[PDB]
């Protein structure tokens, strides 16, 4: 049972439906045949997309914590 | 009148005396409204009277 910064993370995790598994799959295939340019071309896309997903998620949760901490500071 | 009547507090201060015949209430009500200085309305459920 969870707060509102979990609602904000989960909006990304349910937003990018399947990427979290698709990456592992792509790696399982590439590991078997590193010299295949079609596999290499696919993996570059998945790994880049995943890198951006994680950065945008973490910076958004940071910003909402900065808004909340400032409101709470005024309860004095 | 066959309706409940609500009288505003400020109107309830006024006083009246005499012997009255309620033969046709709507016609009596409008005439007294003009003589006494009241205003009235009817929503279909109750009659409201104000100064």
């Amino acid at each position: 049972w969870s707060g509102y910064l979990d609602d904000v993370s989960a909006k990304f995790d349910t937003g990018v439906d399947n990427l979290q598994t698709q990456v592992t799959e792509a790696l399982d295939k590439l590991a078997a045949k590193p010299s295949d340019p079609a596999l290499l071309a696919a993996y570059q896309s998945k790994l880049s997309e995943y890198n951006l997903y994680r950065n945008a998620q973490s910076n958004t949760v940071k910003v909402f914590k900065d808004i909340d901490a400032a409101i709470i500071q005024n309860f004095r | 009148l066959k309706e409940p009547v609500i009288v505003s507090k400020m109107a309830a201060r006024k006083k009246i005396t005499g012997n009255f015949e309620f033969h046709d209430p709507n016609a009596l009500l409008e005439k007294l409204s003009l003589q006494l200085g009241l205003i009235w309305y009817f929503d279909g459920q109750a009659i409201y009277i104000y100064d």
Binding site: G3, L5, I67, D68, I71, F75 | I6, S8, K9
Partner: protein, 94 residues
Amino acid sequence: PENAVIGQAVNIRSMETDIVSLDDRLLQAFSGSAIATAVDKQTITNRIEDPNLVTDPKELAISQEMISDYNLYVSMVSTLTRKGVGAVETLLRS
């Protein structure tokens, strides 16, 4: 509700009648103030224990107001009570 407006036909007030005693008029005040404050304190506490309220800016902005209004209310009741007993004391010691 938000999609409804609800009035009062004409606001007659039976409690505008003075008819009760000077002491019943006191007991009403005391009882009502004591209940209002206990309810407010409880509500404020719940709004903090519950994790979805204490972490959403929309809810925090409201809780800030609740806390301040509570503070002002109690401070004013205290002040006026002191001023009241102080008048009695000033006259009777004169």
